[PDB]
Specification:
Elements: H1 13-24, H2 26-36, E1 40-44, E2 49-53, H3 56-64, H4 75-81, H5 94-107, H6 111-128, E3 140-141, H7 143-159, H8 166-183, H9 188-192, H10 198-223, H11 234-243, H12 249-279, H13 282-295, H14 303-308, H15 310-322, E4 329-332, E5 337-339, E6 342-344, E7 349-352, H16 354-360, H17 396-413, E8 414-418, E9 429-431, E10 435-437, E11 446-450
Parallel strand pairs: 2-7
Antiparallel strand pairs: 1-2, 3-11, 4-7, 5-6, 8-11, 9-10
Helix pairs in contact: 1-2, 4-8, 6-7, 6-17, 7-8, 7-12, 8-10, 10-12, 11-12, 12-15, 12-17, 13-15
The structure holds protoporphyrin IX containing FE and testosterone.
Family: Belongs to the cytochrome P450 family.
Pfam family, one: p450
GO biological process, one term: estrogen biosynthetic process
């Protein structure tokens, strides 16, 4: 089969599509192009041909095979934010990515994933006893900021554990994400005209400098440590690999940065959306509380509990299905292949529109929020909220642990109410790199009233 999509109007076809991505935002443009043309179609970002694909088969094929273990985006943009051939998230150098990923994978599983369940709970407890730092005079909690702070404290105490300014770093991380999102697919032209991107360059420097102070302190503690054997962690493993031949200071420094931003970027907005759903679905809220009563009671949550929390697990999955944050995935073809019907050349960019896929493929009631969608065991080839395979989410397992831990410890303690008739559907969302609340609007706050 030849490839669907707009006409290559002798050099205008590319300019409209890129411009449309810039104008609409990546996610809404993907959804536009998939709805107009097929669920498998072609478009251009800068020069290069990029396939925007919703079909479950193609998705599975792509994530399954090792010759798609790359992403893409502006080299100038990725250099600007420090992700050009450096971290793992947008590290598109195959070999350098291969050697860095294992550090992340170790830290996000085994004993650290077990530690995480109590670390995550104790952190939120701390922040729920200090709700004055986040609550209004009118009782309005800034949930986005609350979550970001506990997510950061969580990430810090597990992976780095150096004292830091939560509030400041959370703002800096937000700044870094805006820059990443802004520059990821900007054309080379953009990067010439300097007073159009110095803005972003500063956000990156703010965060990078802040983290350099922390890794600096972390370095000094490692040098003077007696029992280096016992107290290992993600940041230390990296630093010791650099002390062997294995890694570069620059790369270490970006990996530590990337581990600290991950959850604040994504967990916070996911749990935010999840809380607005609990607020407007009392049917489900009850089921979850009943489960928490049965399973946990008034004991501190423990690793053994999380597998038993079945209703919440379905809620989490249905929330990510219905209202995702990470609704699309960027990949690149490293070898030629046939994919469903169509040929895909080496170097061809790919955007997997997993948000659309979860409304077109397997589920009984795709366009409404119900746990009926997860009453029958969902095959993992029709529902990839995290992705899978050799480049799937490195946090995918621990993320689920973390989300259960915070939803338990919060709902245990508080009823959550939304302002006005607001719901996830009515919130004004930006749909660019990720899918998240437009924070220049308001009515995003919530109210926390106790239980008993
Ligand atoms: C609700 C939470 C989360 C969601 C929905 C999510 C989703 C995703 C998705 C879709 C990808 C792309 C994977 C692919 O291309 O197949 C990804 C990549 C990644 N995620 Fe997450 N994620 C979450 C939380 C986390 C957390 C908590 C961490 C770390 C602490 C993390 C670390 C990563 C990393 C490092 C990658 C890049 C993997 C690579 O390129 O090699 N994620 N995530
Ligand atoms: C999925 C994705 C890679 C992983 C990204 C995701 C954007 C949101 C995000 C923020 C983080 O800090 C961790 C990685 C993630 C979860 C990206 C959108 C396109 C890209 O392929």
């Amino acid at each position: 089969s030849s490839i669907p999509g707009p006409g290559y109007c002798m050099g205008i076809g590319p300019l409209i599509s890129h411009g449309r991505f810039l104008w609409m935002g990546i996610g809404s443009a993907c959804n536009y192009y998939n709805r107009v043309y097929g669920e498998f179609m072609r478009v251009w970002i800068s020069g290069e041909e990029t396939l925007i694909i919703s079909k479950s088969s193609s998705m599975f094929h792509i994530m399954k095979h090792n010759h798609y273990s790359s992403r893409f985006g502006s080299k100038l943009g990725l250099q600007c934010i420090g992700m050009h051939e450096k971290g793992i998230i947008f590290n598109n150098n195959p070999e350098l990515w291969k050697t860095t990923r294992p550090f992340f994978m170790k830290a996000l599983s085994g004993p650290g994933l077990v530690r995480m369940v109590t670390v995550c709970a104790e952190s939120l407890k701390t922040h729920l006893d200090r709700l004055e730092e986040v609550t209004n005079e009118s009782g309005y909690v800034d949930v986005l900021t609350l979550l970001r702070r506990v997510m950061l404290d969580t990430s810090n105490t597990l992976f780095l554990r150096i004292p830091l300014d939560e509030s400041a770093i959370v703002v800096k991380i937000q700044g870094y994400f805006d820059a990443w999102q802004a520059l990821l697919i900007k054309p080379d032209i953009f990067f010439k005209i300097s007073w159009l991107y110095k803005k972003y360059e500063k956000s990156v420097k703010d965060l990078k400098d802040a983290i350099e102070v922390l890794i600096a302190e972390k370095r000094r503690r490692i040098s003077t440590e007696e029992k280096l054997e016992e107290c290992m962690d993600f940041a230390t493993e990296l630093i010791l690999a650099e002390k062997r031949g294995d890694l570069t200071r620059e790369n270490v420094n970006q990996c530590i940065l990337e581990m600290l931003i991950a959850a604040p970027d994504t967990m916070s907005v996911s749990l935010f959306f999840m809380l607005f759903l609990i607020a407007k679905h009392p049917n489900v809220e009850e089921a979850i509380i009943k489960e928490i009563q049965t399973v946990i009671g008034e004991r501190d949550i423990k690793i053994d509990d999380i597998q038993k929390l079945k209703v919440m697990e379905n809620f989490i999955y249905e929330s990510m299905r219905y209202q995702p944050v990470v609704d699309l995935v960027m990949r690149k073809a490293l070898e030629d292949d046939v994919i469903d019907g169509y040929p895909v050349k080496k170097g061809t960019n790919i955007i997997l529109n997993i948000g659309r896929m979860h409304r077109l493929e397997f589920f009984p009631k795709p366009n409404e929020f119900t746990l009926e969608n997860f009453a029958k065991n969902v095959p993992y080839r029709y529902f990839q909220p995290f992705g899978f395979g050799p480049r799937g989410c490195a946090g995918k397992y621990i993320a689920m642990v973390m989300m259960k831990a915070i939803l338990v410890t919060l709902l245990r303690r508080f009823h959550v109410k939304t302002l006005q008739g607001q719901c996830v559907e009515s919130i004004q969302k930006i749909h660019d790199l990720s899918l998240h609340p437009d924070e220049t609007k308001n009515m995003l706050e919530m109210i926390f009233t106790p239980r008993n």
